[PDB]
Write a protein that binds this DNA or RNA. Sequence first.
RNA 1: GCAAGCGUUAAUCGGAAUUACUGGGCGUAAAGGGAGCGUAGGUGGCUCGAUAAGUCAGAUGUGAAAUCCCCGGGCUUAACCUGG
RNA 2: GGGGCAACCCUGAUCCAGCCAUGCCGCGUGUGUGAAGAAGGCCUUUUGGUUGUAAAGCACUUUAAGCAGUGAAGAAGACUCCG
RNA 3: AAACUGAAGAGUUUGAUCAUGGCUCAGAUUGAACGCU
Lengths: 156, 122, 79, 131, 81, 212
Amino acid sequence: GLVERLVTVDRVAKVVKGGRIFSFTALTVVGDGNGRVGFGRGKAREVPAAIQKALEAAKRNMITVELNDATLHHPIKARHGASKVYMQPASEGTGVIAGGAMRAVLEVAGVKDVLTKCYGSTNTANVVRATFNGLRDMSTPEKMAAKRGKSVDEIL
Amino acid sequence: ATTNQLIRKGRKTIKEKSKVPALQACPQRRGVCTRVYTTTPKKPNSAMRKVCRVRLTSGYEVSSYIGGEGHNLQEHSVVLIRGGRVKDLPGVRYHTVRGALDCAGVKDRKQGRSKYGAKKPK
Amino acid sequence: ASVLTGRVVSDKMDKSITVLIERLVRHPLYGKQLRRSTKIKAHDENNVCQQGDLVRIKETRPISKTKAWTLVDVVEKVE
Amino acid sequence: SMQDTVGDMLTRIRNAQMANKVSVAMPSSKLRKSIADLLVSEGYVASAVVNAEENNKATLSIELKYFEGKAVIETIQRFSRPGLRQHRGKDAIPTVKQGMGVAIVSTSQGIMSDRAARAAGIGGEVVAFVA
Amino acid sequence: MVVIRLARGGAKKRPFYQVVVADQRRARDGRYIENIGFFNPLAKESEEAVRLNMEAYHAWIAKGAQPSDRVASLVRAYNKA
Amino acid sequence: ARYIGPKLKLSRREGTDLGLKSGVKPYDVKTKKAARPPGQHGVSRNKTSEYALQLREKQKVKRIYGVLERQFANYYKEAARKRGATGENLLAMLESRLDNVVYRMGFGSTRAEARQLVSHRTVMVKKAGRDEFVRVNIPSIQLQDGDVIAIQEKSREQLRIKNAIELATQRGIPEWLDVDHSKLQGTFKKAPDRIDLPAEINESLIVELYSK
RNA sequence: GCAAGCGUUAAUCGGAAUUACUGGGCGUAAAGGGAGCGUAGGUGGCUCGAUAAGUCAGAUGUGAAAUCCCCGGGCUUAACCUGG
RNA sequence: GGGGCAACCCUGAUCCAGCCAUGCCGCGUGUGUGAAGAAGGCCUUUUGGUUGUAAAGCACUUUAAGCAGUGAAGAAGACUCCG
RNA sequence: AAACUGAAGAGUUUGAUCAUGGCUCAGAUUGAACGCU
């Protein structure tokens, strides 16, 4: 039960003395759909081969995430390089509000309700990496309680 | 920009002036064609684009573009002028409404008739 | 009635005093208070208080064009 | 010069935690001690003791905690800086990380947590966010 | 003088009246000193067509406001009902 | 307004049956299309984007329920206003419409026939707590719980109603609706649940589409 | 795709975190004043008291009606009206 | 609301009516069944595809518009007679 | 009891890249005008 999504397709040029050379680079996000999500980048002369390389990279770059029933535990703000991504939990039935690059990774994660915003650069790769870092940074109330040496009820 | 600096001076948004001053914040405006001629587009394009120098009731002497294939405009013809720049025509910032007052609609227009003032064929 | 306490900036005017009132106003957008001082003119019948004294005044019917306040009491004297 | 004391204590704690220091010491004041006591009661630091030194001085020493290699204090930020004071009502206190953090509030009943102040129906100066 | 009068709101061909205490000079739809009741010409039997505040009406009568005839009749009907 | 053009082409564009035509025979045999998209081109390259998918889902729901975009937008706004899931509320409203409920009851074989039948005032709807039946010519009336539906005395012996009833019996009767054939009487005791409603329809896409 | 409407044009906000208080920057992309001094003004160490102005909490009056929002009611539904 | 004891008079305020798709809301322009997939148009590898259940045929239904009737409610009880 | 529900980006400077930075579009809106109807 693995779900693969292709975030974007891009074409890049490499210049040798004789003439220009064209190569294709692809970004894919693949995940279990419940707790584990990965992003991968592949480069190939042929589009599908780049897609496959991206999938292979994403599978090894899987990380674990923790979620409350279908939404994010708490608001998450993350910066990867220039770009800034902001995520806010939403009530059930709200849906996923995101601009494509965020939407792909969130849908791989399986979050059903979320609100997202982007600041500064809108580059898809940076947005994906910042979102992934925010998901990694997120922690649960029980983990916080263990961190602070207090019971879950004591801390709100 | 510290808090005291913002309080003392503050933030200021300069206001964009309108790209169609001759309309004077109006949807259309009536004028009289003081000249009907043709002109050359910018570097990438080449054509004989049909333009009219028109004096509007707002008092400006502005140049407008005649869209469509063929027109009946000439000297001392009353026309209606709307906004809309022609990208490759410098100094042309308005369009002539076809079929409004005296500018006849395109004769054999069929697809985009309402954009050129052509009646529905029966 | 309304009572305001302030320093008396000027006592030169005959049977009159000018009092400065300090108040704090929150800036709407920025939300940071700014000190604001407004001069208010009050009527002193015996000219009891010299310049620099701290005085309390209350609203009253206009005695003169620019004065609607009276010197009920004087609390502290400049050294 | 040093125009802030609570911010200095907060940044001292933050730098010590980033440097993986076992304990951080600073000049002591009653307000600093109260904030440290609140941190201890919230479980962000192990302990905080004031040692009375000479010349009517005192040293506040705070023993820091580390959980699974990482710092217990994920983030600690000053809110009511001297240049811009922030005072909030009972129903306006900001929540830190959906409540999983703490917003230190100096109220008329002492320096206490945002959730405790909400329970008490009280407000005050929102001094810092610690999570 | 102060006259208690109906004020015409509602929609066209669907009159709804608001009993209001207002100066005689001021218009029907203009400023009113106080609002005491609502009157609905066309209403279901279950619905309450007429609602009024007896204490405020008695207070205004003692004060000396002169109620309008239509409002007086509505008050009589409410009192008997 | 109501669509006046071919019913099948809509279902072919969507790629799955919309229920526009009563299932007297199998849908596949009846039309022998909808394997490929309509028009000359049929199968095409440059696969559609996610926004296109959301648009397709909204067009599916509107086409199934015979509801224009303006009414659909009003319904979505009301769903967002109401408490709970917006897609669930919107689906509940689309079920609540009178034409749909009569079609589920089986008085009308198809939703369009039901809409026309209701607009013609053959169907009478009694609101809860009302002892007198009232004729209604608006098929878009929302139904409160416990509402009762009757056929007018003129319309009791309609041939199309009788032919529609047995097709409805073959299709099945929903649990929430209670239908008495002999008296031609239908009661809307409860609104349909989301679990009861078809799983294949996706509510979330419609919510995504309206969020810009 | 909309549908007794549909487009164009004109205007306002949004997207624009593109005047950034929420919520931006200043080595090289625009941006540190040539440097110091200092006026008004801004901010400001530790301990024990008085004061309660700012701050917080509660009481009262007021903050007209409509409009916004919530729950009910009436128009065959809706707009609309309407009590709280 | 103005005047009058009242009868009653004035009231372009007000309540309505005519015009405008100018905005919002609602509804209709039909509903089922219908194949060698009729004819024609278009594309085509010239023979297939598409228009397309779309149509014709066939069986119904009359909201709205038009005709014939019927008919609330907006009215508060004036004045007059009697206690 | 309820009033406490809400946040998307894209095209464009380069052989190609990232940033920065402007310009343009996707929405709602209106006492609205003009064109077909």
